[PDB]
Amino acid sequence: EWNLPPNAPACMERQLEAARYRSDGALLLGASSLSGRCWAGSLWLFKDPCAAPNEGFCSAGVQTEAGVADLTWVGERGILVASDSGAVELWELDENETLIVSKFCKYEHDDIVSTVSVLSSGTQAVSGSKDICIKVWDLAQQVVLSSYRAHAAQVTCVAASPHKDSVFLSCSEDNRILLWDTRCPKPASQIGCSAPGYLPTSLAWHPQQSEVFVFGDENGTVSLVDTKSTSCVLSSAVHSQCVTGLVFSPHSVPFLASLSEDCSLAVLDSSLSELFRSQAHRDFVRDATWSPLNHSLLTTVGWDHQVVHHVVP
Amino acid sequence: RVSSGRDLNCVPEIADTLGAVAKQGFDFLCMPVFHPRFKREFIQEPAKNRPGPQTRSDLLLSGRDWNTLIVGKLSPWIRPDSKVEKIRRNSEAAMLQELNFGAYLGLPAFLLPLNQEDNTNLARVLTNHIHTGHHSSMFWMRVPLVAPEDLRDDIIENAPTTHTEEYSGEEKTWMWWHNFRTLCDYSKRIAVALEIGADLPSNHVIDRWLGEPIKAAILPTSIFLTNKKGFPVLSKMHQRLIFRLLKLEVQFIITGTNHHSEKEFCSYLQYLEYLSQNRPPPNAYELFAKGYEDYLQSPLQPLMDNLESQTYEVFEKDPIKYSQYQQAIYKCLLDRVPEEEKDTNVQVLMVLGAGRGPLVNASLRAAKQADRRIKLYAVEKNPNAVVTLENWQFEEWGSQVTVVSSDMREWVAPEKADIIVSELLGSFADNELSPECLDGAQHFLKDDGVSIPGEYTSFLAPISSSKLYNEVRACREKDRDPEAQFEMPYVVRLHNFHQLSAPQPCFTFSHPNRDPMIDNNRYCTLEFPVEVNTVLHGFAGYFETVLYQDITLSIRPETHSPGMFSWFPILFPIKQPITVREGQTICVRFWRCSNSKKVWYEWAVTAPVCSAIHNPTGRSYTIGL
Ligand SMILES: O=C(NC[C@H](O)CN1CCc2ccccc2C1)c1ccnc(NC2CCC2)c1
Ligand SMILES: Nc1ncnc2c1ncn2[C@@H]1O[C@H](C[C@@H](N)CC[C@H](N)C(=O)O)[C@@H](O)[C@H]1O
């Protein structure tokens, strides 16, 4: 309680959902209250990454109406939020960067919005929900351009391609990983290994090859997939439980951060061999973000309310 | 007025949320009891030892509010039938936890989804919970008219939506529910929350839910069309389903966000209220039968027991049965005595089973309408009704009516009758032993004498109803055969059922019966063409009767008499439900049996599969002579 600036809440809810480093080195935090009297959420900015999760030494903060199931940076001051309320909302950062103010809040999904990703241009975004739909957004115009009901069960993850504004991945509990291209009349294409295995839970594009990606399944296995091959290249049983997220390092030859509900972090090479493992968390590990300033520094958040900074070999 | 609720998957503050939905006009709320995203671990450390609280407090609402306003929802992450063992285990425990919490709170209902084919383990865990402790919560199964896989946009290049139509394939959703409630052994605690879609399926797969225990109908906001003034309305075929559901009486549940931001949320509800206010009002029949829906009544013993004063009182109010009888006597008098004889020929009329005397009055009204003269006998075996009769004949009727206190099979008549009038009919026509009674009494009808009624015919139709099948099952008593409930017919205002084929004639009786050897025993085979997939739970009985010539009474739905509440259908159940496929023929066999002391029915199904012969020997049900 050193400061806690104007508009920022006095307290932060226990369940840390997302952590995202900005290009300038500042750290974005998304959090939910998943128990107790109030089931809400909050957004936080920490220009001092070591100061988190302490509400006292924060740059900015705000309370959302409902929980934060997912979020992402929009450029440098925009914050895009996947909400429990069914709404997708955009929060615009202050010019002094001390207030987080709502820009739009659009109630378009019929259920919890579980996943969001910003497309390469930064003008458009794709959201995924439990209402089984996937939606394409115009961020400047504050509207849905396209709505897609391709899946047969709730949407788990949507990930925009690094460089193509019309391509994105999506996976659902209907056991489908879909490769999208909204230029086609039939935009979705079912991509997998050979035989349908365990439900896909997490997706990450390669930061340099817009043609390869990794997917984690609910059984703790991480796999490498080539799009132009449609064959599963390499796979490893990384975790003992569901893989909830995958984040590549900003390195030349990138390392892969892998988080799981078994409360552990893993860092793997390009051939998916284990380099580092952290059991520093006592609850679910929810997000991982690599430091832009130090490329061997990696930050993880969990439902244990721990913000942890790792040093990776 | 409709009873409706709001479905929500997001509740930041239970106090504020409930207030808002109440102000909007909803009767109840469907909400999670734990946070939908709050996945809990039960087995491996450290997530297992996650500091509490696990959810919010019961103290946040009054006991009354939990009991009447809240419907619980299972957490969407709970997958008891997952292929992953670890997820299977956690979901088993999480389901029990959430269910126990609902029971702890005293919730009136709790929602669980059927969103896939295999729900075996979900069924097992729920069955296990039902048989653990003491609670009376309803379990609503959320199941859609159309499966999500068969509703998806045709937008996957390498996986097209199989365009070739499938009659059975479009019915898969009913088989999801059917299998579930079979595994749970038709627990009376498991009902249906049917999810309506934008594309209503083909009309048959809608029929499928006819006769299932539907307690709620879920309407997503996304299915609502918008009119010229920007208000939510429904398609003509959607209105059709709504009216069918209103007739069945179900609760409606609005789900999804408000997709019409120009107006309030109560507008969706305003429309349902509008639709309910716009139904046709109850007819004369539905006003008297209003509270009898699917209520099973034990078979009456017409000869061994005596009817209560209040029983006679109710039926005497029938707007059609008596005037129809008056007209039948009116037509018969004219036909029997020509104009030139209107003062010389006095017709002898005998009311056999006169009750409290309304048919006697009907006979008097008929004679003074035909301008003919009659002599009345009023025979009644119920000595208590005889009281009413003799007070009537002293105060009003006079010597024109001779009251006889005896059984018609016994009464030694002083003279022979021109016309015998009787109303001895049960719901299956001959199930109050009208044949046997009029047979023992016809010896005092003149050789050219008329019997009113002249003849009667019973009818049968096969039916589907899990609702009624459960009601019969629940009629098990101590100190008798554990399966006797299934071997007797019930008088019931059939409501939540599906008729699987058109009624066909069963047994017929004519009066008088100048047959040399009189035999009332019967054996009849009926074949019922069925054109839907379904489950057979029993046979609805109806009847028709010829009073005189073209004057008739009927409870057969095709030819039913307007306003006549006096008879409800009968239900003949069967021990075990029988699967029937589209295009198959149901073959039933009915026997009418008897000895000197009693009359009973025996019945069996021979196709598509056999049932056990029901009620052999009258071991479970007879009607005493
Ligand atoms: O069908 C029913 N019972 C079978 C009897 O054979 C019906 N008849 C009707 C005419 C009648 C008249 C006088 C005395 C008894 C009876 C029984 C029945 C049972 C319970 N309620 C019924 N209808 C409700 C009365 C208001 C609607 C009909
Ligand atoms: N074998 C019998 N002999 C004389 N009366 C009978 C016999 N069987 C039935 N009844 C009487 O016939 C009546 C049948 C009633 N459904 C009709 C009552 C009356 N006629 C009415 O329509 O309101 C009952 O009052 C019975 O008690």
Residue A185's domain is classified under what CATH number?
Answer: 2.130.10.10
DSSP state of B238: H
**Residues of chain A positioned with their CB less than 8 A from the CB of B221:** 110
Q: Which of B162, B245, B234 has the alpha carbon at shortest distance from B197? A: B234
Count of all residues that appear for chain B in the document: 625
Are B615 and B488 spatial neighbours (Cβ–Cβ below 8 Å)? yes
Sheet-wide strand order for B373-380: B401-405, B373-380, B346-352, B417-421, B445-452
Distance CA B574, CA B558 (A): 25
H helices of B184-278, in order, are 203-207, 236-248, 266-277
Are B598 and B623 spatial neighbours (Cβ–Cβ below 8 Å)? yes
Count of all residues that appear for chain A in the document: 313
**Atom 10 (ligand 2) nearest CA:** B353
B 30-89: CB under 8 A from A = 35-39, 41, 44, 46-47, 49-50, 52-57, 60, 76, 82-84, 86-87
Q: Is A77 helix (H, G, I), strand (E, B) or coil?
A: coil
Q: Which residues contact B472 (CB under 8 A, 6 or more apart)?
A: B296, B485, B486, B490, B538, B571, B573
Domain that holds residue A205: 1-313
CA triplet B169, B174, B180: central angle to 5 degrees?
A: 125
Distance CA B377, CA B351 (A): 6
Strand partners of residue B113: B142
Q: Is B413 exposed, middle or buried (0-12, 13-18, 19+ CB in 10 A)?
A: middle
The count of other CB atoms within 10 Å of the CB of residue A258 is 29
Which CATH class, in words, describes the domain spanning B1-287?
alpha beta
- Range(s) for CATH 3.40.50.150 in chain B? 288-454
Distance CA B270, CA B305 (A): 52
- Quick check: CB of B568 below 6 Å from ligand 1? yes
Q: Closest-lying ligand to the alpha carbon of B423? A: 2
Q: Closest-lying ligand to the alpha carbon of B438? A: 2
Measured in Å, residue B354 CA sits from the centre of ligand 2 at: 6
Q: Which of B325, B426, B394, B318 has the alpha carbon at shortest distance from B366? A: B325
B 169-228: CB under 8 A from A = 220-222
Q: Which two tokens stand for residue B453?
A: 């009624």
* Catalytic-labelled residue, pool B98, B212, B432, B471: B432
A 153-212: CB under 8 A from B = 153-154, 174, 178, 184, 186-190, 198
- Quick check: CB of B288 below 6 Å from ligand 1? yes
**Pick from A34, A111, A218: CB nearest B9:** A111
Query: What does each C-alpha distance from A106 to A82, A139, B220, B259 come to in angstroms?
Result: 11, 11, 18, 11
Q: Which of B161, B119, B38, B222 has the alpha carbon at shortest distance from A131? A: B222
B432 as an active site residue: the answer is yes
**Atom 12 (ligand 1) nearest CA:** B315
Looking at 2.60.120.260, 2.40.50.140, 3.40.50.2000, 2.70.160.11, the CATH number of the domain B455-625 comes to 2.70.160.11
Which CATH class, in words, describes the domain spanning B288-454?
alpha beta
**Structural domain count of chain A:** 1
* B407 annotated to bind ligand: yes
**Residues of chain A positioned with their CB less than 8 A from the CB of B98:** none
AA letter at B480:
R
With CB atoms and an 8 Å threshold, state whether B13 touches A37. yes
